[PDB]
Design a protein around this ligand. Structure first.
Ligand SMILES: Nc1ncnc2c1ncn2[C@@H]1O[C@H](COP(=O)(O)OP(=O)(O)O)[C@@H](O)[C@H]1O
Ligand SMILES: Nc1ncnc2c1ncn2[C@@H]1O[C@H](COP(=O)(O)OP(=O)(O)O)[C@@H](O)[C@H]1O
Ligand SMILES: Nc1ncnc2c1ncn2[C@@H]1O[C@H](COP(=O)(O)OP(=O)(O)O)[C@@H](O)[C@H]1O
Ligand SMILES: Nc1ncnc2c1ncn2[C@@H]1O[C@H](COP(=O)(O)OP(=O)(O)O)[C@@H](O)[C@H]1O
Ligand SMILES: Nc1ncnc2c1ncn2[C@@H]1O[C@H](COP(=O)(O)OP(=O)(O)O)[C@@H](O)[C@H]1O
Ligand SMILES: [Mg+2]
Ligand SMILES: [Mg+2]
Ligand SMILES: [Mg+2]
Ligand SMILES: [Mg+2]
Ligand SMILES: [Mg+2]
Lengths: 367, 367, 367, 367, 367
C-alpha cells in the first residue's frame, strides 16, 4: 500500500503516488465561473469549473485563486480542487492510501485546524501528515546541510538546515513570489499601448514571463543601452490575434524580487533575507550555508539567477572562504519528488496521525 | 510674464492664462467633417471644422474624437485643435508665454515623447511642463493629504497621496468614466423606440445625462418600485421635434461606474478601486484617506454621489473611524484652477523644461 | 548655573535640566528618511527627520535605530538627535551649562572615544562627564547597598554594588531587554492571520505589548487552560480600524526574558543571570543582595514581574533567609532622576572633565 | 601485559598504553546535546555525543564540561568519555590490561569513593591506582628533587618534593588555570565591538589565546605604548569569515595568572604561591627548591613564561644564590609520559589495588 | 587618676581602665583596606579602616594582621589600632592616665626599643611599662607559684615561676596557637567539596572552631567510628544561607596542638613543653609545678582540655605525687584582669618609666 503525496500550494497542483519520479496530475488552482450566459445553443450549463478546462475558455469563464499567499482565504472553493483530483486524474480512492499533504512554513493556526478537518470528516483518509516545504524539498538533492530558498507563488521562505537540526528562528518570510511579479508586470506593460485590467488576461502575460523574461546580470548596465533595440526584443503572438513586442520590460520585471522598492515595502530582497537569517544563527554553523545554498520553487527558473547569487552575496559576505550555488534542472517538483521518497522509509510510518488520535484528543496534536 | 495652462484631455478643453480663477475658452475635442453635400445660397464652404462651431451643425457634419481613453489615437487631428486655440480664443502667441500641459497618470510612452515634439518643433514654446491630474486638482482645495478621485471622460484614475509623498504603486486605473457611460445608454434606450446609430446623435443623449440622469442612493430598492412611474419620469424636448420620456433608465446608467457587470468586464467599480489601493498602502497612512477623499473630473457632477460613497465604503471599511467626503462646487475645472495657481509660486519656475535642455538631452528627461 | 542631564540610550531619550523631577522632552531614537519620490511643489522638505515628528509619518518615513544594543552602530545619524534637542525642545545653549551624558555599562571602547569627541569639537561644552547606568539608577531610591537590575531596551545589565564599592568582575550582560521582545512578537503574531513585515508596523505592535502583555505567575499552568476563550483575550483598537484579538500571545511574549530558548541562545534568563553574578562575589556580601535587589529600566513594567522574582529565585537559593524585592512606581525615569540629584551635590563638581584637560591629555583620561 | 594510562583531568583527555612516549587518543571533555527540535526523518540520532565529533557541530550541540575545577560536578556524563575511549580510540578491552587513572591533588573525598566504584561495578578492571599529578609529572624529567608547578585546566597545584618525602603542608591550591583565563577573555574582548555570550563561542576564542596570546615581560611596559600599535596586532581568520584584530588584549589576558585582582580576587598569583609555600617548610631544604622548579600542565604554554619567572622571583627571593628554571619541550603531556614509565618498574606493580581486595575492605583503602 | 591597661596581642585587643573586672574595648586586630575602586559620589571614604567596623564589610575590605606570631611585621598598621582605641572606645586622653602595655616573653630584641618609641614620640604618655604575659596572668587567681601556660593567638609561651623567682633557662616557646589552627582548618575543610581561598572567609571558619570544634579525650578511639556519622556531626548556619556539615573535622583540628605531625615541624606537642621545662628547673621545686599548672589565653576555651591534661601528663610523670589542673572561668581575659590589679599596689607604682628618664638614659633601660 503506497501513499499519496499532494502539494496544495498556490499556482499549480502537484499530486501523485509516492515512490515515483514525476506526477501525472498538474493543473492550476483556478475556480472558473460563467460570466454572462450562452450565445449558442448546446453547451454545458454547469457552474463548478475545476482543472485544465477553464484554461481553454478564459475569456468566457471567471478565474479566481482560492489560496492567497499561502493563507487559505476561501474554503468552499478549496474543497473543489481536492475532490476533482482523486476522481478524475489520479482515480484512486482516499480510503485505501494515506494522503501526505504539504503546507508552507510559518502558516497561521487558522488553516492547520481546518485543513485536517476536511481530510477527516469529508474525505475518509486513514492517516495524514503535514510538514514544512523546506524538508520535502531537501531530499531532492540527497543532502542534509545548507539553506533551502523556496519561492513558488505564495510566500518566499528561507529555512536553513544543519544535519537535520532545523532552526525555526531563522524562518524569515518574504512576500515576493510569482504572484507578486505578475502584478508589477501589469502596470509596467501598459506604458506601450497594451491596456489590460481584466482578470482573464492576467494569466496570458504570465506565460510570457516564464520564457522571455529573465534575470539579468546587472541593473544599471543594460538600462542605458536599452534605447537601441537590437537583441532585447522579440515578437510574441497571442491567441486573440495581436502582436506584442516588449523592450526594456524583460529584465526589470524579475528585479522586484531583488529590489522591494518597486512594490513599496521596506523589507529586504531575496539576496538579503538569505544573508540576514544566517547572522541570527550560531557562528559555528555560519560556514556551511554559503557554499551549500539551494534554491527551489517554481518562480526560481529565470535563466540568470544562479549567475547573480555569486555577486551580490559575495560582495556583502567577506570574500575569504568558498561560495558555490547548486541549481539542478527541473526544480519545480523538488517538493513532490523529495516527499514521495520520504514516505518509502520505515521510520516515516511512525509519524502519521491516526484516526483514533484526532476525534479523541483534538486538532491540537498535529502541531 | 504669465503662463498658459492647457488641459488637453478627453471630453472638453480647458485653456487660459495662469493666475486666473475661471477659463474663458471651453470646447469639446471634435473634428467636424462634411459627410453629405448641401447646396444653399448663403452657407459655404469651409472643409475642416474645429472648435465650438461644429456643435451648431451636427446633422450635416460628422464628429470624431481624436483622443481615446487618454491614449492619443490619431495625430493629424490633435494638432488642429491646438493651433485653432491660441490664434482665435486666447489670441496670444506661444513664443511669449510658457505652456503648461496636463496629462493622465499611467500614460503610455507613445504619447509623452510625441507631445513634447509638437510643442518644440512646430509651436515654438520657450518652456513646457507635464504632470499628473491628481496633483493639479489637489491645489484647488488647499489641502495636503487626501486621495484624489479624478473621473474625467476617458479613464478614471485613483492616485492617493499622504502629505506630498505620493505613491505611484497605488495607481489603479479603471476604464469607467464619461465616454464609457454614453455607450451603454444607447443600447438601453433602443427598447423604448428611441434608437440611434449615427455618430452625430451620440452627443445629444449626453446632454440629457448631464442634467436628468443622476446617482441614486440604492439600486435594488428603486427597481421594484419602477413599475409605477410617478416621480422618476420627465419629458425632454428634442430639437428635431420629438418627446423623450425615460423612467427606469435614469439611475441605471450611472450605476455602471459602481457595477461594471453591465458592459462586460471583470473589473471592479469606482468604490472598490478606491478601497483596494488603500490596502496596498501602509497601515499608518490608512487613517487619513477615508475622511479626506476628494473627487474631481467631469464624471462627478451627478447630484447624488457624495451621499452614496458614505454607505458603500462604510459597509466594507470598519465603522470605527469617521468617513467624510468633500465635494466643493465647480469641481470640473479643478485641473485648470489648480494648474494656474501652481505656476504663481517662485519654486515652480525651477521645474520648467528649457528649450536648450531638450535639444541637448532628448526624449528621456520628461519622465 | 545648573547642569544638563541627558540619556543617550536605545528606545527613548530622557533629557532636561538638573534638579527637576520629571523630563519635559521625550522622543524616540528614530531617523526619518523618505521612501518613494513624491512629485510636488513646495513640499517638506527635511531630508532627514528627527524627533517626535516621525511618529505621525511612520509609513512614509523609513524608521531605523541608530544605536543597536548599546553599541553606536551609525554615527552621522546619532548627531541629529543631539542637535535637535538643544535647539527646539530644551532651547539651551551648551556653552552655558555642563552636559551629563549616560551610557550603558560594559560598552566597547570605540563608543567612549567618539562620544566625547562630538561633545568637544562640534558642540562646545565646557565640562562633561560619563558614567554607567547602575550608578545613576541607584540614587533614585536613596539607598547605598543593593544590586541594580537595569533593563531598558538594548542590553540588560546586572551590576551589583555593596556600599559604594562596585564590582566590575560581577558584571554579566544579557541581550534580552526591550528590542528582543518586539522581534519575537513579530514572528508569533502571524500565527493568527495577521502578517507584518514592514518596519512601519514594528512600533504599532509595540504599544500593544506595553499595556496588554504582562508577566504571569506560571508558564505551563495558564497555557494548558488557554484553550477556552475566557478572560485571557481582549480586542485592541488599531489606528486603522481593524479588530485585532490575541489569545495565548499575551504572557508567552514576556516569557522570553526568563526562557531564552525561544530565540535560540544558550544564555541564562533574567532570573538566572542575577543569581550567577552573586556566586562570583565573596560570601560576606552574598546576604545583602537578595533582600535589596532593585529592578529598573523601561522594559521592567509588566504587572507581574515583582510577583515572579520571589519564586524562581527563592527556589534556587536556600530557603532560610529573607528575599524582598523593591519596585517603586515610575522606574523608567529612575536613570534621569538619579542623575539630576547627583549633579546637585558639592562633591560632584570636582569630577567633571575640563575642556582644556582633554586637549592636553587625550581620550585615555575618560575611563 | 602493559597498562592503560588515562587522565581524567579537565580540558583534554590523555589516554594510551603504558611504555610509549605520546598518547594517540586526545579529545576535549565535552558533551553533545541537541538544542532545538528539528523536524526530520532519519537524522542522527545519538542523543548524547562524545569525542571530537561535537567540535564540528558546536553551533547546535550545547557544550558542557562534566568536570569543574577538578571536582566532578556531573557524573552521568563523566562515564560517557570513559566508555567511548575504550571502544573507539584505544580499542582495548579493560578486562585484559589494568587502567591507571590520574587525579588532581587535594581532591575532595566525595570523588575518590565514586571514581573507583565506576571502574569496578560498570567496568571490569583487574587493578587500578590513583595518586597525585605532581609526582606523576616528576618522573618525566629524571629528577626527584624540586617543586612541581602543575597548571592543567581547572585548578593550579604547587606540590614540592624532597627525595620521595612529600610535604602536604606546602600544598596551596589556586583557582587560576586554563578555564580561569578564557572567562576573563569573554569580558575583555567585547570592549572593541565584538559581542560574545554563546557557549559555543567559548572554544572559538580559546584557540586565539593558545597561539596569539602570550605572557609579556612586564605589565606597565607594553601598556603605555599601546597607542602606537606597530607589532602587537595581528588579524585572525575565523571559520565564518569575520576579521577580528586585537591590540593590547594579547598580553593582559594571561596576566590574570600573575595578578588575580582582575576577576575580583585578593589571592596570590602563580609567582607568589610558589614562594610562600617554601617559607612554610624547613630551612635546609630552601636551597633545593629555587633552582629546581619544574612547570607542567596545559596552561603553562605561553611563549614568555620562563622568561618572567627569573625576574619576579629573583626580586623577592634573596639574590645570594642561583635560581634556574627548567622547561623541557612538550610539557603538556608530561603527566601521561611520567605515568607510563612509573608503571614499568617492579616496585610499582606491588602497589595496585586488587579487585578482590576492594570488595573485602571497602572504599576506605583507596586513600 | 587611674591607669590604662592595654594588651597588644595578636587576634583581639583587651584595653580598659585599671581596677575594673571586664574590659569594655574589644576589637579584632585587622586593618580594613579598599580592594576595588567604586565609581560613586559621597561614599566612605576612610582609606584605612580600623576597629570592629571591618567585620561588617569583610567581603570588600582586605583583612591583614599587623602583628605576626608576636613579632611586629608592619609598624604603619600597628599605630592605627592604638590611636583608634584612645579616641573612640576608651575616649580618654593618654596625657592624663599612664598606659600599661604587655609584650610576649623571649623576644629577639625587636618589640622593646621600637614599641616604647611610639608611646613617646607620637603619643604623649607620662609613664609606661612592659613585662611578661605569664606573670601578669598569674595575679588574676591570687597565687605566686605555678607554671603559666599562655596560649593566645601568636606564640604559646611557657614561663614558670617559683615565688617571684623566674628561671629564664626554662622558657620554651612553641609556634602552636590560635592562628596556627585556623590555617590547618583551611586545608582540611576543602576535602568535602567546600573550597575556600578568600581571606574574608578565614574569620568565618574561625568562628565555627570557637564553638563546635573542641579537644576530644583521645584520638584513635574516635577515628574508627568516624565513618558512621551519628552524633559527631552538626549543621552550621552561614550568614549567606549555605548548609555546611562537618563530620570528623571537629576534633582533629585542635589535635594539631598535641600532635604537630599534621604540619611537619620537628617540635613536640603542647603537653611535652610543660613537662620538659620542669626537668630543666631545680629538683626540690618539682613538686609544685604539676599540681599548680595554670592554662590561659585564647586557645584554651575548648570544652575538653581539663579532661586530657590529667592523662598524657600523668602517664609521663611518675605516679608518686599529686597532679591537679586549675581552670577558672573567663581565662581569656586573665592578662587584662591580672594586669589591672597589679597596678593598684604601691610597690608597682615605683617601677614605671618616667618621660624625663627615657630621654636621658636611652632604649637600653627597657629590659
Ligand atoms: N520558467 C518560469 N519562469 C518564471 N516563472 C515561472 C516559471 N515557471 C513557473 N513560474 C512561476 O511559478 C508560479 C507557479 O508556482 P508553483 O509551481 O505553483 O509553485 P509550487 O510548486 O511551490 O506550488 C507561477 O505563478 C509562475 O509565474
Ligand atoms: N453636469 C454633469 N453631469 C454629469 N456628467 C457630466 C456633467 N458635465 C460633464 N459631464 C461629463 O464629463 C465628460 C467631460 O469631462 P471633461 O470636463 O472633459 O473632464 P476634464 O475636465 O478632466 O477633461 C463628458 O463626457 C460628460 O459626460
Ligand atoms: N509599560 C511597558 N511595558 C512593557 N515594555 C515597555 C513599557 N514601556 C516601555 N517598554 C519598552 O521599553 C523600551 C524603551 O526603553 P527606554 O525607556 O528607552 O529605556 P531607557 O530609559 O533605559 O533608555 C521600548 O522598546 C518598550 O518596548
Ligand atoms: N598552546 C597553548 N597556549 C596557551 N594555553 C594553552 C595551550 N594549549 C592548551 N592551553 C590551555 O590548557 C588548557 C587545557 O589543559 P589540558 O591539556 O586539558 O590539561 P591536562 O593535560 O592536565 O588535562 C586549556 O584551557 C587551554 O587554555
Ligand atoms: N571559645 C573559643 N574556643 C576556641 N578557640 C577560641 C575561642 N575563643 C577564641 N578562640 C581563639 O583564640 C584566638 C584569639 O586569641 P586572643 O583572645 O586574641 O588571645 P590574647 O587575649 O592573648 O590576645 C582566636 O584565633 C580564636 O581561634
Ligand atoms: Mg513550493
Ligand atoms: Mg481630468
Ligand atoms: Mg536605562
Ligand atoms: Mg595536568
Ligand atoms: Mg595571651
Amino acid at each position: 500500500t503506497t501513499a499519496l503525496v499532494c502539494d496544495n500550494g498556490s499556482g499549480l497542483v502537484k499530486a501523485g503516488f509516492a515512490g515515483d519520479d514525476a506526477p501525472r496530475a498538474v493543473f492550476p488552482s483556478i475556480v472558473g465561473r460563467p460570466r454572462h450566459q450562452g450565445v449558442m445553443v448546446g453547451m454545458g450549463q454547469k457552474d463548478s469549473y475545476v482543472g485544465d478546462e477553464a484554461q481553454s475558455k478564459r475569456g468566457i469563464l471567471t478565474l479566481k485563486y482560492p489560496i492567497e499567499h499561502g493563507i487559505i482565504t476561501n474554503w468552499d472553493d478549496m474543497e473543489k480542487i481536492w475532490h476533482h483530483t482523486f476522481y478524475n486524474e489520479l482515480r484512486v480512492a482516499p480510503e485505501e492510501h494515506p494522503t501526505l499533504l504539504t503546507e508552507a512554513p510559518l502558516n497561521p493556526k487558522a488553516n492547520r485546524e481546518k485543513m485536517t478537518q476536511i481530510m477527516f470528516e469529508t474525505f475518509n483518509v486513514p492517516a495524514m501528515y503535514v510538514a514544512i516545504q523546506a524538508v520535502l524539498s531537501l531530499y531532492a538533492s540527497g543532502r542534509t546541510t545548507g539553506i533551502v530558498l523556496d519561492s513558488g507563488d505564495g510566500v518566499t521562505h528561507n529555512v536553513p538546515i544543519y544535519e537535520g537540526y532545523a532552526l525555526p528562528h531563522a524562518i524569515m518570510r518574504l512576500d515576493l513570489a510569482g504572484r507578486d511579479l505578475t502584478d508589477y508586470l501589469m502596470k509596467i506593460l501598459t506604458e506601450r499601448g497594451y491596456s489590460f485590467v481584466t482578470t482573464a488576461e492576467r494569466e496570458i502575460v504570465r506565460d510570457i514571463k516564464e520564457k522571455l523574461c529573465y534575470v539579468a546580470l546587472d541593473f544599471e548596465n543594460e538600462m542605458a543601452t536599452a534605447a537601441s533595440s537590437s537583441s532585447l526584443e522579440k515578437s510574441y503572438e497571442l491567441p486573440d490575434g495581436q502582436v506584442i513586442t516588449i523592450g526594456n520590460e524583460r529584465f526589470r520585471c524579475p528585479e522586484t524580487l531583488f529590489q522591494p522598492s518597486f512594490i513599496g515595502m521596506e523589507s529586504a530582497g531575496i539576496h538579503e533575507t538569505t544573508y540576514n537569517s544566517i547572522m541570527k544563527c550560531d557562528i559555528d554553523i555560519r560556514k556551511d550555508l554559503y557554499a551549500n545554498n539551494v534554491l527551489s520553487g517554481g518562480t526560481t527558473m529565470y535563466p540568470g539567477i544562479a549567475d547573480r547569487m555569486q555577486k551580490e552575496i559575495t560582495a556583502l559576505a567577506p570574500s575569504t572562504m568558498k561560495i558555490k550555488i547548486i541549481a539542478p534542472p527541473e526544480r519545480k517538483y523538488s517538493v513532490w519528488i523529495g516527499g514521495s521518497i520520504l514516505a518509502s522509509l520505515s521510520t516515516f510510518q511512525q509519524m502519521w496521525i491516526s484516526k483514533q488520535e484526532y476525534d479523541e484528543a483534538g486538532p491540537s496534536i498535529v502541531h
